[PDB]
Design a binder for this molecule. Structure first.
Ligand SMILES: [Cl-]
Ligand SMILES: [Cl-]
Ligand SMILES: [Cl-]
Lengths: 222, 221
């Protein structure tokens, strides 16, 4: 009956978690320990054959998967005032900007950087070849974000939206996990628009409090 | 006036090309001539990421990200919903459609094919990356094999933009990785996926559209 969000304290897991809480949506949260063998169990793979978090099981029992897609689903379903997103009829221009940035955040930020790094981290090391790939990918993503954020406060329209949630959660994760790594980049110096935007996004309502609930340590690097 | 699709001949680029051509949509296509054209100022104004493809709509607005362009062209030009499911009409299939477009872009392309293509140069790829790429493809194909079990198409009962997204990625995988250390033959372990790929390229004139390369002289095709 009631919707259930199965998730973990990760760059992808935290996105719909933040949105659901900002909306006070009737969504029960099942927070996995991290890492967990639960997502390899039969019952989970039935909900999400990709074997990744998060999964939202909706109020009819159907799984919705892919973090940035779940953002869209939760907004459409529970954000009745459109506080955190733009609908196609509401404002088509902004709707398409929102959609493209959710694809971009997923592919060019999360997938190209954090997911690749974590998949190739073992025993306190990421191989130099992968490490440089990831570093160059971060360089590209930050150049893009810096440009997009030029002359504005938020990614889309004139307010904090699901696009800001997607980007802020990835960036918060990067700072949480990679500050002590060979692939750290300090934004203060070369990407001032992104830094300014991050600080205002993390400061929005209770976003920071939500993210702190299951705070993680930096990855160890020899 | 007319919408314009700027592309190359790539895993992302052919997706909106295929849909547009299948719809006989009023979209002019310009293929750039390995190119640094996409670093030019006018192009960066349309797509600050400096990549292809970009669709500029009939009002001068750029739409980016291949799988998103699929959705936009479908909403805009697919009046009869031949190639997609709308949220209003079929919300259940709409969300399955949306999640698979995210999957194809992230797990198939970004996390796997893109990494493979970038790191396989001049017939060589570092062993550690090759191993990452192979394990990733094995997982993705297994997923697709599961999704396609007892089905002809990825979503609903017809060829859709999800099939377009997956087929273009698979076409590009074959075009670049066939004679390499990270080749995988689907016939061997993924027969559902092989059968689906053949069915998808055989759909209408898909195979023809995929053969299209830049015109020699003319700006548009
Ligand atoms: Cl996602
Ligand atoms: Cl895409
Ligand atoms: Cl990509």
């Amino acid at each position: 009956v009631m919707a259930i969000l199965y998730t973990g304290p990760t760059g992808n897991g935290r996105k719909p978690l933040v949105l659901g809480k900002l909306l006070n949506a009737p969504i029960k949260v099942h927070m996995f320990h991290w890492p967990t063998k639960d997502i390899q169990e039969d019952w989970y793979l039935k909900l999400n054959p990709a074997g990744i978090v998060p999964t939202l099981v909706d109020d009819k029992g159907t799984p919705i998967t892919e973090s940035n897609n779940i953002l869209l689903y939760i907004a459409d379903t529970y954000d009745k005032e459109h506080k955190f997103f733009y609908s196609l009829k509401q404002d088509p221009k902004l709707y398409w900007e929102q959609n493209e940035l959710l694809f971009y955040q997923a592919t060019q930020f999360q997938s190209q950087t954090l997911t690749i790094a974590n998949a190739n981290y073992q025993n306190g090391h990421i191989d130099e070849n992968i490490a440089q790939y990831v570093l160059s990918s971060f360089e590209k993503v930050f150049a893009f974000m810096e440009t997009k954020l030029s002359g504005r406060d938020w990614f889309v329209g004139d307010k904090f939206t699901i696009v800001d949630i997607a980007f802020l959660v990835g960036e918060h994760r990067r700072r949480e996990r990679l500050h002590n790594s060979p692939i750290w980049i300090d934004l203060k110096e070369n990407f001032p628009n992104v830094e300014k935007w991050f600080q205002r996004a993390i400061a929005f309502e209770n976003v920071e409090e939500i993210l702190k609930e299951h705070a993680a340590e930096n990855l160890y690097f020899q």
